Design a protein around this ligand. Structure first.
Ligand SMILES: *[C@@H]1O[C@H](CO[C@H]2O[C@@H](C)[C@@H](O)[C@@H](O)[C@@H]2O)[C@@H](O[C@@H]2O[C@H](CO)[C@@H](O)[C@H](O)[C@H]2NC(C)=O)[C@H](O)[C@H]1NC(C)=O
Ligand SMILES: *[C@@H]1O[C@H](CO[C@H]2O[C@@H](C)[C@@H](O)[C@@H](O)[C@@H]2O)[C@@H](O[C@@H]2O[C@H](CO)[C@@H](O)[C@H](O)[C@H]2NC(C)=O)[C@H](O)[C@H]1NC(C)=O
Ligand SMILES: *[C@@H]1O[C@H](CO[C@H]2O[C@@H](C)[C@@H](O)[C@@H](O)[C@@H]2O)[C@@H](O[C@@H]2O[C@H](CO)[C@@H](O)[C@H](O)[C@H]2NC(C)=O)[C@H](O)[C@H]1NC(C)=O
Ligand SMILES: *[C@@H]1O[C@H](CO[C@H]2O[C@@H](C)[C@@H](O)[C@@H](O)[C@@H]2O)[C@@H](O[C@@H]2O[C@H](CO)[C@@H](O)[C@H](O)[C@H]2NC(C)=O)[C@H](O)[C@H]1NC(C)=O
Ligand SMILES: *[C@@H]1O[C@H](CO[C@H]2O[C@@H](C)[C@@H](O)[C@@H](O)[C@@H]2O)[C@@H](O)[C@H](O)[C@H]1NC(C)=O
Ligand SMILES: *[C@@H]1O[C@H](CO[C@H]2O[C@@H](C)[C@@H](O)[C@@H](O)[C@@H]2O)[C@@H](O)[C@H](O)[C@H]1NC(C)=O
Ligand SMILES: *[C@@H]1O[C@H](CO)[C@@H](O)[C@H](O)[C@H]1NC(C)=O
Ligand SMILES: *[C@@H]1O[C@H](CO)[C@@H](O)[C@H](O)[C@H]1NC(C)=O
Ligand SMILES: *[C@@H]1O[C@H](CO)[C@@H](O)[C@H](O)[C@H]1NC(C)=O
Ligand SMILES: *[C@@H]1O[C@H](CO)[C@@H](O)[C@H](O)[C@H]1NC(C)=O
Ligand SMILES: *[C@@H]1O[C@H](CO)[C@@H](O)[C@H](O)[C@H]1NC(C)=O
Ligand SMILES: *[C@@H]1O[C@H](CO)[C@@H](O)[C@H](O)[C@H]1NC(C)=O
Ligand SMILES: *P(=O)(O)N(CC)CC
Ligand SMILES: *P(=O)(O)N(CC)CC
Ligand SMILES: [Cl-]
Ligand SMILES: [Cl-]
Ligand SMILES: [Cl-]
Ligand SMILES: [Cl-]
Ligand SMILES: [Cl-]
Ligand SMILES: [Cl-]
Ligand code: NA
Lengths: 527, 527
C-alpha cells in the first residue's frame, strides 16, 4: 500500500512493474475545482481539501474536445484521440515516481500538444513510467482545457478572460511546487517539457511572470509561441467569441450576457460550432488559443522575446525532419496516406491555397518561387516534397530556430536537435518520412520495452535521448557522458550548431534551413 | 590546320567538336628521349629537337605494366587497364586547348594513379576535352614509367637511382614551363591534379625542390605521400631490387652489374617478376614506388611535412565515402562483386590478415577492437562495412586528412571535400558504395555529355565540381560563385571544416572520421 499525504488530502497510488523493477503511479489526482456551471470559461479555482483517501489508480476524464474522424480504424490518427471519457470535469494530473521513493528527485512536467483544441495526458506515448524507472526522475502530466472551453476570450472580462487552459497548466505547476516533496520530488528542480502546442505552452510559461518561479528549465519539441498558429490576435479572438455566440444563438449586447448564455449551452453545442468560427481554416487552424490577456501574457509575446523579457534559464529545443507531411492528408489536393502522393504543380498551387487562405496571391507565388527552383525539374516527387517542407518550415522549424536564436542572445545556454529517425513501426506511409509527433515515443522510452517490436537500434536511440533529456533536466546539460557519445554543443547566434538524432551517427551541423528560414523569417512576414 | 611551334619542333593537333564548340587536342607529344636500352632505369633525358611536323593526332604508347586480369570482360575493372600499346617508349604527353586559342589560359596538369605500378594518361575518364571546352583551361597529362622500370632503386647509383617516374612527371612539368605559352597557356598559372598514386605524386612535387617552380597550386584526390602505400623504405627498396635480380638470375656483386644485367632483360621478364619481390603483399601493394633518393626527395617526407618544408600555396584535398571497398574483392575471404558479401567475424579476421600481413597479432586485434564495437551486433552487413572502412580509412582518408592538417598549419589555405555520390552507371555492386576512383569522371566532366546516360542531377553535380576545380586553379579558391552554392570554407586545424559533394545538398561538416583517424593516426603507427 502506498499513500502520500498532500496539502488537500491523502492519495493512494498503484505499483507497476517496469523492466524488472517498480514504479509507483498516481493517476488522476485532482488539482482544481471542476470548471463546471458558473466556473465554465473561468480561471481554474483552487481545490477545497478532502479528508479520506483519494484513489489515484486510473487516468481521469480528458477535457471536452473534437476528435479526429478522418481515418476511423487507422492507428496513425487514432493513437492521438482521447482514451478516457471526455468531461468538463477533467482538471487532473498524473505523478509517476521511482520505487523506492526517491529522496529529492528531479521533476519532468509534460504538457501535451494538439493545437490547443485537443489532446490528453493519458495517451500511451505520454506514459511516464519508463522515465521514472530508467532515470529515476518523477514524471508529472496534467489535463488542461482545450478549445473554446479553454481559450475563449472576451478580453478583460473574468467571465471569459482568455488563456484559461494556460492557467490550468499553471495551477498544476503550483500543485507540484506545494506537493511534490511529499512524493520524493524536488520542487527546485522542475523541467517543463511538451510537444507542438504543448511546446508553445512551455515557451509562454517562459514568458509568464506567474510561471517564473514554478519551474527551473524548459524543453520545447516541435513548437514555440512564435509559430504562426500559436497566438490568436485580440481582433481574431473577439470575432471568434462573437461568431461562436452568433452560432449558438447567444448573441447579446451585454458581453457578460453572451457568456452566461454560453454557459447554458452544452459542451457538444459549443464543440460542434468551433470549426466554423473562421471563414476558412486550415488543417493547422487554432481557432481558440492563447491571447494577450494582460494577465498570463502581458504583451505581444514577439515583443517580450525580442526585448529579452523572459525567464533566464537553459532551453532545449528541437524539431523533426518532416514536420509538415502529416498535415497534407487533411485537405491538400492529390495527397493520400494510401498512395505515394506524387502531386502536380497545379496541385502544389491549390495546396498553398489550402494552407495559406488569405494569403495575397503574391504571398503564395513567393512561396512557390522560393520552393520550386528545382535541382532538377526531373524528379516526380519534387512538388510533393516541397509542399511538406513549406508546411513544416513555416509552421514549426523556422519559428523554433528563431525562438532559439533570440532566446540565446540574452545569454543563456540553449541546445537545438534535429530529429531524423523514422519509427520502424510508423503506420503512415514512407513518403511522410520523419513525421511531426513521432519523436515523443523515443523521448518517453517506449522503445526500451523490448516486448514491443522496435528494432535494436531504436532501443539504443531512445535510451540515449532519455539520458540526454534527463541530464538536461537535472543538470542543464543534455549530454550522454558515458558511451563515447557526440558532445552536444550549445546553440549560439553566429554559429547555430545543432545536433542530429538518428540511429546511424549523430552529427554536429550548423544553420539548419538557413535559406528557407531567411525566407519565412525575413521576407514572408511582410506579405 | 593547327600547327604550334615548340622548343623542339612543330606539332600538329586535331580539332574536336565538343558541345557544339571546338577543342584542339595534341595527343602524343614526346617530352623526353625514349628510355630504352642504356637509358632503362635512368632519369629521363631531355628531347633532341626535330625539324618537320610531329603529328599529335593520337594517344601514344602507355608505359610497360602488369594488367588487372581479375575480372575479364568486366568494365568496372577493365576501364582502368591501358588502352594503347605498352612500350618502354611511352614518354609522351597530351595537351587540350580551347578553340579559339586562349590568350593566357590557366593550366591543369593531370597525373594518373595506379599504385605507381600501372596506369596511363589516355583513359577515357582522363580526357580533358570537356574541361577545355567548358572552362577554357588548358589540360595537360603525361605518361610516366611505373613498376620497376619507373621506380627501381639502388640508392645513390644513377644507373638505377629511384624515382625515375617522378622525374618523368617533372620533366613534363618543365615542358609545360617552356612550351605552354606557344599554345596559349600561362606557365605562371599551373595547377597539378591527380588521383590516388597520382595525388601522392602531386603531394611529393609539393615537397620536391626541383618541382617548386614548375607549378602554382595542387589538387589531391584520394591520395597523399603520407599514405602507408606511398613511399618505399631504403631497406625495402634494396631488398626488392636484389630480389628482382635474384628472380631474373641477375644477382651480381657489382651493383652496376646487377643493373646492366637487368637492362638485358626484356620488359616482360621484369614485369612478370615484380609481384614476387615481396614475401606477401596485399591488393594495395606498391612493390616499386617513390623512395628517399637524396635527389627528388631529400629526406623522409614525413619529416619534411612535420617541419614545414614544402612549397607554400593553396591545396585542395579530397576523398570518397567508400575508398576501401574496391580492394576487398581482390583477396578478402567471402567478398565478391557478384553478391552482397555478408562476411563473418572470422572472415573479417582473415581479411585483416589479407590487408595487414606483418602485422603483429595485437596490431590486428586492435583494429578489430576499434572497428567492431557494434551499435548494434544485430546488423548482418556489420563486418562487411567494417572491413572496407578499415581499408579506406588506413589507406586513404586519414592520411589525406592528416596531410591537410599539417599542411595547413603552416599558413596556407586548404580546402577538403568529402565525395559521397555513387555514379548512376557504376558496374560494381551497390554494397561497394561510393568507390575509390569514381569521382574522376565527375571532375573531368564526363556527365556534361548528355548523350551519355548519366542522370540530370549528375550533370549538375559535375558542372559544379568542374567550376570549383577550375576556380581553384585560376584563383586559388574552389567556389562556385553564381548559383547560390554552399560556400567552401578553408580547412583549419582546430575546426577541420570540409565540404560534402553529392547530388542532393552539399554540406559543411567538421572533423571527418575524427574517432577512426585518432586510431590510425596516433595509435596504430606504434604497433
Ligand atoms: C470575422 O467574422 C466574420 C463573420 O463571418 C462568419 O459568420 C460566422 C458566424 C461563421 O459562420 C463564418 O464561417 C462566417 O464567414 C467574417 O465575415 C465573413 O467573411 C467572409 C469573407 O470575408 C465572407 O464571405 C462572409 O460572407 C462574411 N460574413 C459576414 C456575415 O459578414 C470575417 O471574415 C471574419 N474575419 C476573418 C477573415 O477571420
Ligand atoms: C492518390 O490518392 C489520392 C486520394 O484520392 C483517392 O484516394 C485513393 C487511395 C482512391 O481511393 C481514390 O479513389 C480516392 O478518391 C488521389 O487524389 C484524388 O485523385 C482522384 C483521381 O481523380 C480525384 O478524383 C480526387 O479529386 C483526388 N482526391 C482528393 C480529394 O484529393 C490521387 O490521384 C492518388 N494519386 C496517386 C496514385 O498518386
Ligand atoms: C627481404 O627479402 C627476402 C627474400 O625472400 C624472397 O625471395 C624472393 C626472391 C621472393 O621469391 C620472395 O617471395 C621470397 O620470400 C625475404 O626473405 C623471406 O621471408 C619469408 C618470411 O620472412 C620467408 O618465409 C622466406 O623463406 C624468406 N626467404 C629467404 C630466401 O630468406 C624477406 O622476408 C624480405 N623482407 C620482407 C618481409 O619484405
Ligand atoms: C559471395 O560470393 C563469394 C565468392 O565466392 C564465389 O563467388 C560466387 C559468386 C560463386 O560463383 C561461388 O561459387 C564462388 O566460389 C562466396 O565466398 C566463397 O564462399 C564459398 C562457399 O563455400 C567458398 O567455397 C569460397 O571459399 C569463398 N570464396 C572465396 C575464395 O572468397 C560467398 O560465400 C558468397 N556469399 C554470399 C552469397 O553472401
Ligand atoms: C533537494 O535539493 C535542493 C536544491 O537542489 C537544486 O538546487 C536548485 C537551485 C536547482 O539547481 C536544482 O536543479 C538542484 O537539484 C535543496 O535545497 C533541498 O533542501 C533538497 N531537499 C531534500 C534532500 O529534502
Ligand atoms: C599571363 O598572366 C601572367 C601572370 O598571371 C598569373 O600571375 C601569377 C602570379 C599567378 O597568380 C596566376 O594564377 C596568374 O594568372 C603575366 O605576367 C603574363 O605576362 C601573361 N601573359 C600573356 C597575356 O601573354
Ligand atoms: C480505494 O481503493 C481501495 C482498494 O483497496 C478501497 O479501499 C476502496 O474501494 C477505494 N475507495 C473508494 C472506491 O472511494
Ligand atoms: C450588463 O448586464 C449584466 C447583467 O449581469 C451585468 O453583468 C453588467 O453590469 C451590465 N453591464 C452594463 C453596465 O451594461
Ligand atoms: C551505455 O552503454 C551500455 C553498453 O555498451 C548500454 O547498454 C547502454 O544503453 C548505454 N547507456 C546510455 C545512457 O546510452
Ligand atoms: C601528318 O599528318 C598529315 C595528314 O594530313 C600528313 O601531312 C602526313 O601523312 C603526316 N606525317 C607523317 C605521317 O609523318
Ligand atoms: C664494378 O665493375 C663495374 C664494371 O662497369 C664498374 O661499373 C665499377 O667501377 C666497379 N666497381 C668497383 C670499384 O668494384
Ligand atoms: C548555374 O545555373 C544555370 C541555370 O540555373 C545552370 O545551367 C548551370 O549549370 C550553373 N553553372 C554552374 C557553374 O554550376
Ligand atoms: P500541435 O499541437 O500538433 N499543432 C500545432 C498547432 C499541430 C496541429
Ligand atoms: P591508387 O593509385 O589507386 N592506389 C594507391 C596505391 C590504390 C591501388
Ligand atoms: Cl532532377
Ligand atoms: Cl553518438
Ligand atoms: Cl537544411
Ligand atoms: Cl543493430
Ligand atoms: Cl549547393
Ligand atoms: Cl565520420
Ligand atoms: Na520575395
Amino acid at each position: 500500500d502506498i499513500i502520500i499525504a498532500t496539502k488537500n488530502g491523502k492519495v493512494r497510488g498503484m505499483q507497476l512493474t517496469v523492466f524488472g523493477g517498480t514504479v509507483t503511479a498516481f493517476l488522476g489526482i485532482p488539482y482544481a475545482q471542476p470548471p463546471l456551471g458558473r466556473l465554465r470559461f473561468k480561471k481554474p479555482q483552487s481545490l477545497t481539501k478532502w479528508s479520506d483517501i483519494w484513489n489515484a489508480t486510473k487516468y481521469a476524464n480528458s477535457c471536452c474536445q473534437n476528435i479526429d474522424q478522418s481515418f476511423p480504424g487507422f492507428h496513425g490518427s487514432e493513437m492521438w484521440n482521447p482514451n478516457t471519457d471526455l468531461s468538463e470535469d477533467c482538471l487532473y494530473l498524473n505523478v509517476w515516481i521511482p520505487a523506492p521513493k526517491p529522496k529529492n528527485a528531479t521533476v519532468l512536467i509534460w504538457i501535451y500538444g494538439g493545437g490547443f483544441q485537443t489532446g490528453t495526458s493519458s495517451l500511451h506515448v505520454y506514459d511516464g513510467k519508463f522515465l521514472a524507472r530508467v532515470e529515476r526522475v518523477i514524471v508529472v502530466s496534467m489535463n488542461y482545457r482545450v478549445g473554446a472551453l479553454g481559450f475563449l476570450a472576451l478580453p478583460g472580462n473574468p467571465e471569459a478572460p482568455g488563456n484559461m487552459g494556460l492557467f490550468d497548466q499553471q495551477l498544476a505547476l503550483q500543485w507540484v511546487q506545494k506537493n511534490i516533496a511529499a512524493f520524493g520530488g524536488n520542487p527546485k528542480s522542475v523541467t517543463l517539457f511538451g510537444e507542438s502546442a504543448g511546446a508553445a505552452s512551455v515557451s509562454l510559461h517562459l514568458l509568464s511572470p506567474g510561471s517564473h518561479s514554478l519551474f527551473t528549465r524548459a524543453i520545447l519539441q516541435s513548437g514555440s509561441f512564435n509559430a504562426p498558429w500559436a497566438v490568436t490576435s485580440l481582433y481574431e479572438a473577439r470575432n471568434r467569441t462573437l461568431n461562436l455566440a452568433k452560432l449558438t444563438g447567444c448573441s447579446r449586447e451585454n458581453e457578460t450576457e453572451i457568456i452566461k448564455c454560453l454557459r447554458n449551452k452544452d459542451p457538444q453545442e459549443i464543440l460542434l460550432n468551433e470549426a466554423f468560427v473562421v471563414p476558412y481554416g486550415t488543417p493547422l487552424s487554432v481557432n481558440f488559443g492563447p491571447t494577450v490577456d494582460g494577465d498570463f501574457l502581458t504583451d505581444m509575446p514577439d515583443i517580450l522575446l525580442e526585448l529579452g523579457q523572459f525567464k533566464k534559464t537553459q532551453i532545449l529545443v528541437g524539431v523533426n525532419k518532416d514536420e509538415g507531411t502529416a498535415f497534407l492528408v487533411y485537405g491538400a489536393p492529390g495527397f493520400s496516406k494510401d498512395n505515394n502522393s506524387i502531386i502536380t504543380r497545379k496541385e502544389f498551387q491549390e495546396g498553398l491555397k489550402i494552407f495559406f487562405p488569405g494569403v495575397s496571391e503574391f504571398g503564395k507565388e513567393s512561396i512557390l518561387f522560393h520552393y520550386t527552383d528545382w535541382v532538377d525539374d526531373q524528379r516526380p516527387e519534387n512538388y510533393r516534397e516541397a509542399l511538406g517542407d513549406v508546411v513544416g518550415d513555416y509552421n514549426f522549424i523556422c519559428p523554433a530556430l528563431e525562438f532559439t536564436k533570440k532566446f540565446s542572445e540574452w545569454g543563456n545556454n540553449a541546445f537545438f536537435y534535429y530529429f531524423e529517425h523514422r519509427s520502424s513501426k510508423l503506420p503512415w506511409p514512407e513518403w511522410m518520412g520523419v513525421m511531426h509527433g513521432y519523436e515523443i515515443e523515443f523521448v518517453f522510452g517506449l522503445p526500451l520495452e523490448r516486448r514491443d517490436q522496435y528494432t535494436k537500434a531504436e532501443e539504443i536511440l531512445s535510451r540515449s535521448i532519455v539520458k540526454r533529456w534527463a541530464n538536461f533536466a537535472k543538470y542543464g546539460n543534455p549530454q550522454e557522458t558515458q558511451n563515447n557519445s557526440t558532445s552536444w554543443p550549445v546553440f549560439k547566434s553566429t554559429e547555430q550548431k545543432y545536433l542530429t538524432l538518428n540511429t546511424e551517427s549523430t552529427r554536429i551541423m550548423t544553420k539548419l534551413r538557413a535559406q528557407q528560414c531567411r525566407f519565412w523569417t525575413s521576407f514572408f512576414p511582410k506579405v
